[PDB]
RNA sequence: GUCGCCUCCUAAAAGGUAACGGAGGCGCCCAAAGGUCCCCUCAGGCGGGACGGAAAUCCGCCGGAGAGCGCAAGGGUAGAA
RNA sequence: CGCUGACUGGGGCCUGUAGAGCACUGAUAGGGCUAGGGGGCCCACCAGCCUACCAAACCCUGUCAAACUCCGAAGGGUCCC
RNA sequence: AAUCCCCCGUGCCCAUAGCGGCGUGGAACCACCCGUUCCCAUUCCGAACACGGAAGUGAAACGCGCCAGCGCCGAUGGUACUGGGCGGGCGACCGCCUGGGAGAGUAGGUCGGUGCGGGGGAU
C-alpha cells in the first residue's frame, strides 16, 4: 500500500506573543489568519503578573496558506538539524512549529474511539 | 425597603404615561442615569419605560 | 457589643425533602417527586437517575414535578392502563 | 462521563429538546451523498419512508430541487396516511441551504412546520 | 384446610405494641385459652410472629 | 464508640507521632508473630513505646513488623469546669478490633526473637495473644 | 485424602469434626464435604503449595485442591473452605514458593538483612508440571541494594503470571548500613 | 458565652429529635450570571517551540467531567447549569 | 358515617447506617522505581561523577474515616390487593 | 413488493458493547475527495460549518471478525452484620435458638444483544 504512510501535509503554525497592540498587524500582512489569544500568569519575571491579558499571538496556518509561507519563508532560516523533535514535528526560530502527518495522525481527533495515536504510525 | 445608600437603591419607571409604574431594585454600581425598558400601563399595552425616579 | 469565637458551637436548622406519592399510587395533578423545589415537573413517571434504570408510578393525569437532577425529570410517559376509554 | 459526554459533536439532546412534544420528528438524516428522513412520532412511534433520495432513484438535480422534491413528495406520502402538522427535525447540522431545502419540501409539502 | 388451634401463654404484659394487636386480631381475649383457624398465611403470619406467644396445633 | 470532630475541622490530618513499623529481618516460611483479642482505642504512646522497647531488647532479624497505628483521639478538661464542654485534644490511637493481626516475629529459626516479642507482649497492655502463623514457628 | 460429605448441612457440620469445603471444579460443584481433621494433617503440609486429592467413592481421584479458604474466625481455626481440581492440561494459576539458603553477604558479616515481600510465586509453568519446591538465590546482600521481578531467573516452564521489577527481596539495615 | 437563617455529620438507613455536640457559611448581590436562537466540548498529564527554565502562549496525542458554575457547604450535572 | 383501623399475607416503589470496600477524598505503615534537598568526589557554572541520609509523585506488599464510599443487606416506609 | 446475507438512516437495553493488538471492505454504500463566483460561513483561513462536481482512494472516521493484557460482568459452598425469641458474665461484652444473608475472595464470563425504516444482495 506504500500509498498510505507516505505523507500529505497537515497543519503548521507560526506565531509569537509579548506581554503587550498591532505587532500582530505585521502578522496579518505576511499571511491571512489572525491569531487572537490571551496569555497570562501572575509574577514579575518580566512584569507579566497580569493574569488575564491579551498578549498571546498565534497565526494558525495549515495546508494551502502555510504553503505560500513554507515557501516565501523557508529560505531565510538556516539550520536543518536537531530541532527535530519526536512526535514527528519540530519548532525553530521568532516562534514557529510544524507537525508531521503520517497516515495514523487524524484519528487522534475523534471524540469517539479516540485511538491514543499508536507510536508505530506516527 | 431597607434604605441603604449602598449601591442598593430602589426605583421604578413610568409608561410614557401609560400612567403609573411597576416594581424594581437597582445599583448605581454601573450606568447611573441609565434605565429604560417597555411594559404596559393601565394605558393600553406596552409603552416605552424609563426607570429613573 | 459583639459576638465571640473559639466556640464553634453552631446548631443547624430544618429541611423537609420527600418522594411524596412514592411509586405507583392514585395519581393527582399535584406535587410529584420532590428533592429540589423551583422544580420543573414532567410527564407521567420518571426513570432517569444516577442509578441506572427507571421508575413507574401507575398514576396518570396532567403532570408531576421534578427536583432539579436527583430523582430524574419525567418524560417517559406512562398514563397507566387506568387511562383508557372509561 | 456518560457515553454522550466524552465523545463529541452530536447534540441528540437538542433533539430531545423537541422530543418533549410538538409532533412527528420530521427528522431529516443527511449524508450528502443524499438525504434521508423519517418520522419518529412520541410513543415508541415509527415512520413511513416519507421521502428518500433512492426511494425514487437519486435523480441528477443535486442539492437544490433534490430536496425541493424529496420533501414535498414526502409531505405528499404522509398526508395520505393521516398526519397533518408535523414538527421539523434538523436531524443534524444547521438548517443549511440542503436542510432548508428538504424543509421547503415539508412546507410546500403542505405538511405544516 | 389446615385448621390451627393455638393456646395462651406468657402474658403479653408490657410486650411489644403490635404484637398485642396480633393478639386481639387472631382473636385473643382472656388468658390460656384455645382458638382455631385455617392455615391462611395471613392469620398464619400474625400468630407465628406472635410465636413464643403461646402454642399452635394443626387441627380442624 | 464516641469518636472525633472531623478529619480536618477538629483534629484530623496528623502523623500521630510514633516510631514507624518494620524491624527484625525477613524469611520465607517461618511464621512468628503476635496478635490480640481485646478491644481498646490502643493507647497510642503506650503503643508507640511498647513495640519499641521490643527492639530495645532484641536488635535485628525477627519481622519486627507490626500492623497497628492510632489515628483518632479523646479530649476533656479545658475552660470553665464541667458543664458545656468545648474540647481539648490529646491521645490518639486506633481500635484493636476484638483481636486481629498484630505485629509479626517472622523468620526462619530465630526464636531468640520469639522470646523477644514475647518480652513485647509482657508489655503492651490489653493482655495479648502469643501465637504462630501458617505452619507455626518452625 | 478421603474427606466426605456434600448434602446440605453446614451448621452442625460446620461443627464438631467436619468443616465445610466445596467440591469446586471448572463446570460443576457439589455440596461441601471434607472434615475438620483432615484439613489438618494435609493442609498442615502445604495447601496450595504442592497438591494431592482424596478418594470419595473413588469418584474422581484428581488434584488442584484449594484455591481459596480461610482459618478466618478470630480464634484462628478455619471453617468453610473452597476446593477445585484440574484434570486438564491448562494448569495456570500456579503459585508455588521459592527459597534461598543464607548465602553470607550482608548478614554473617554486615549483620544487615533483607525483606522478602515475595517468598511465593503465582505463575503458570507446565500445567500439572511443577517442582513442589523450587529454589533460586543468586546471593548478594547489604548496603542499599535490592532485587525484584525483572532480574529474577526462571527455569523451565516459562510463565511469570507476574511482572518485572517488584517485591523480590532486598537487604536493609537490621540496625544500620 | 448564646440567641435568625443556609449545609455537613448526629437522624440508627421514610420522614424527624435534645445536648453550652461536632465543623462552616448569610442579613450579599448580578442591570445582565436576565429571555431565547445560534455555536463550544474542562481541569489535568505527556511530547514539541517565542519573549518563556515553576507557573503561560501554540501544535499533536490521552481523558464515567477529577475541572466548570460571583459568593458556604451539599445535590447537580457537559446532554451542560 | 360502618369494615375503612393497629397487625399479618401479597405486590410494586423508595432510604441507603451496621458491615464491607479501597479507583472519590484525607490519613498512614514496610518497601521499589524516581527526581526535588542532600551528601562525599574532579575545585566544583561542575552543572560532570558515584552513593550509604530526607523527600514529592507512579508501582507491589499492607492498614484506619461521623461530617469518605465504585458496594450494599438487617429493617422501616407508602399506595394498591 | 408480506424469507435469509449485506450496508445505511437509526432507535431500546446506561461497559457480558470500553481500551487496545492484528486484519478485512469498497461494483454497490459511505466517507475522505475535486474546486470555490453566488446561498451561508469562520473573532484566522470555506480545516469545522459550506455550495457546486467526474476522475483518485480506502490510508484515515467507519462496519463485521479474531485476540483476555488492561479493564467490565460475575455464581455455588462460605464468613461478617441482623429483624425475632432467650440464656452467661459486675466487665468493655460473649453465646444460643429462628427466617434474611453482601462486598471483597478463586471458578469463570464479555469482546454487545436486540427494534422500525431506507438502498440493495438471494429467479
Swiss-Prot record, chain E:
PROSITE patterns: RIBOSOMAL_L30
UniProt keyword annotation of Ribosomal protein present: yes
One GO BP annotation of this record: translation
Alphabetically ordered keywords of this record: Ribonucleoprotein, Ribosomal protein
Any one GO cellular component localisation term in the record: cytosolic large ribosomal subunit
Keyword hit for ATP-binding: no
GO terms for MF: structural constituent of ribosome
Record Pfam families: Ribosomal_L30
Record-linked NCBIfam families: rpmD_bact (TIGR01308)
Similarity comment: family membership: Belongs to the universal ribosomal protein uL30 family.
Subunit structure: Part of the 50S ribosomal subunit.
Protein name: Large ribosomal subunit protein uL30
Organism, scientific name: Thermus thermophilus
Amino acid at each position: 500500500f506504500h500509498e498510505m504512510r507516505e505523507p500529505r501535509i497537515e497543519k503548521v503554525v507560526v506565531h509569537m506573543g509579548i506581554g503587550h497592540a498591532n505587532a500582530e498587524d505585521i502578522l496579518g500582512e505576511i499571511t491571512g489568519q489572525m491569531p487572537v489569544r490571551t496569555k497570562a500568569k501572575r509574577t514579575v519575571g518580566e512584569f507579566d503578573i497580569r493574569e488575564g491579558d491579551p498578549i498571546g499571538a498565534k497565526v494558525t496556518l495549515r495546508d494551502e496558506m502555510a504553503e505560500e509561507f513554507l515557501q516565501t519563508a523557508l529560505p531565510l532560516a538556516e539550520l536543518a538539524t536537531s530541532q527535530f523533535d519526536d512526535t514527528g514535528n519540530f519548532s525553530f526560530g521568532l516562534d514557529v512549529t510544524v507537525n508531521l502527518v503520517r497516515p495514523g495522525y487524524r484519528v487522534a481527533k475523534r471524540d469517539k474511539a479516540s485511538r491514543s495515536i499508536p507510536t508505530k504510525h506516527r | 425597603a431597607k434604605d441603604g445608600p449602598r449601591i442598593i437603591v430602589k426605583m421604578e419607571s413610568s409608561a410614557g404615561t401609560g400612567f403609573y409604574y411597576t416594581t424594581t431594585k437597582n445599583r448605581r454600581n454601573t450606568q447611573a442615569k441609565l434605565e429604560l425598558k417597555k411594559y404596559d400601563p393601565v394605558a393600553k399595552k406596552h409603552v416605552v419605560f424609563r426607570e429613573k425616579k | 457589643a459583639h459576638k465571640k469565637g473559639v466556640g464553634s458551637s453552631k446548631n443547624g436548622r430544618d429541611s423537609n425533602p420527600k418522594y411524596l406519592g412514592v411509586k405507583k399510587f392514585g395519581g393527582e395533578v399535584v406535587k410529584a417527586g420532590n428533592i429540589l423545589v423551583r422544580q420543573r415537573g414532567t410527564k407521567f413517571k420518571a426513570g432517569q437517575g444516577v442509578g441506572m434504570g427507571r421508575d413507574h408510578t401507575l398514576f396518570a393525569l396532567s403532570d408531576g414535578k421534578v427536583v432539579f437532577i436527583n430523582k430524574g425529570k419525567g418524560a417517559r410517559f406512562i398514563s397507566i392502563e387506568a387511562a383508557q376509554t372509561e | 462521563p456518560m457515553r454522550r459526554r466524552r465523545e463529541a459533536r452530536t447534540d441528540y439532546h437538542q433533539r430531545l429538546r423537541l422530543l418533549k412534544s410538538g409532533k412527528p420528528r420530521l427528522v431529516a438524516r443527511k449524508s450528502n451523498k443524499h438525504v434521508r428522513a423519517q418520522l419518529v412520532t412520541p410513543n415508541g412511534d415509527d415512520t413511513l419512508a416519507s421521502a428518500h433520495s433512492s426511494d425514487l432513484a437519486e435523480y441528477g438535480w443535486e442539492p437544490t430541487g433534490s430536496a425541493y422534491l424529496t420533501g414535498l413528495l414526502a409531505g405528499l406520502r404522509a398526508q395520505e396516511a393521516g398526519v397533518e402538522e408535523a414538527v421539523l427535525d434538523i436531524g443534524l447540522n444547521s438548517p443549511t441551504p440542503k436542510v432548508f431545502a428538504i424543509q421547503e419540501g415539508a412546507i410546500d409539502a403542505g405538511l405544516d412546520i | 384446610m389446615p385448621r390451627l388451634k393455638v393456646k395462651l401463654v406468657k402474658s403479653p404484659i408490657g410486650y411489644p405494641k403490635d404484637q398485642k394487636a396480633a393478639l386481639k386480631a387472631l382473636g385473643l381475649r382472656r388468658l390460656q385459652q384455645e382458638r382455631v383457624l385455617e392455615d391462611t398465611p395471613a392469620i398464619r403470619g400474625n400468630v407465628e410472629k406472635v410465636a413464643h406467644l403461646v402454642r399452635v396445633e394443626v387441627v380442624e | 464508640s464516641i469518636k472525633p470532630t472531623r478529619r480536618e475541622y477538629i483534629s484530623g490530618i496528623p502523623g500521630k507521632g510514633i516510631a514507624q513499623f518494620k524491624m527484625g529481618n525477613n524469611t520465607y516460611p517461618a511464621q512468628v508473630e503476635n496478635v490480640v483479642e481485646k478491644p481498646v482505642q490502643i493507647r497510642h504512646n503506650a503503643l508507640e513505646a511498647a513495640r519499641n522497647a521490643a527492639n530495645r531488647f532484641v536488635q535485628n532479624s525477627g519481622k519486627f513488623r507490626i500492623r497497628k497505628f492510632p489515628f483518632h483521639v479523646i479530649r476533656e478538661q479545658d475552660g470553665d469546669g464541667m458543664r458545656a464542654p468545648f474540647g481539648k485534644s490529646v491521645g490518639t490511637a486506633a481500635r484493636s478490633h476484638g483481636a486481629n493481626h498484630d505485629f509479626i516475629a517472622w523468620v526462619n529459626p530465630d526464636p531468640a526473637v520469639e522470646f523477644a516479642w514475647r518480652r513485647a507482649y509482657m508489655k503492651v497492655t490489653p493482655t495479648v495473644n502469643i501465637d504462630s502463623s501458617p505452619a507455626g514457628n518452625a | 485424602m478421603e474427606l466426605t460429605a456434600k448434602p446440605r448441612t453446614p451448621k452442625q457440620k460446620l461443627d464438631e469434626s467436619m468443616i465445610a469445603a466445596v467440591a469446586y471444579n471448572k463446570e460443576n460443584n457439589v455440596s461441601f464435604a471434607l472434615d475438620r481433621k483432615a484439613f489438618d494433617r494435609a493442609f498442615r503440609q502445604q495447601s496450595t503449595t504442592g497438591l494431592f486429592d482424596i478418594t470419595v467413592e473413588g469418584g474422581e481421584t484428581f488434584p488442584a485442591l484449594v484455591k481459596a479458604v480461610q482459618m478466618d474466625k478470630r480464634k484462628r481455626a478455619p471453617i468453610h473452605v473452597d476446593f477445585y481440581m484440574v484434570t486438564y492440561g491448562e494448569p495456570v494459576e500456579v503459585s508455588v514458593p521459592v527459597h534461598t539458603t543464607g548465602r553470607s553477604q550482608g548478614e554473617v558479616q554486615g549483620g544487615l538483612v533483607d525483606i522478602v515481600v515475595h517468598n511465593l510465586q503465582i505463575v503458570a509453568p507446565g500445567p500439572r508440571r511443577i517442582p513442589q519446591e523450587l529454589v533460586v538465590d543468586v546471593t548478594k546482600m547489604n548496603i542499599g541494594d535490592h532485587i525484584t521481578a525483572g532480574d529474577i531467573k526462571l527455569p523451565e516452564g516459562c510463565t511469570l503470571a507476574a511482572d518485572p521489577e517488584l517485591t523480590v527481596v532486598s537487604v536493609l539495615p537490621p540496625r544500620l548500613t
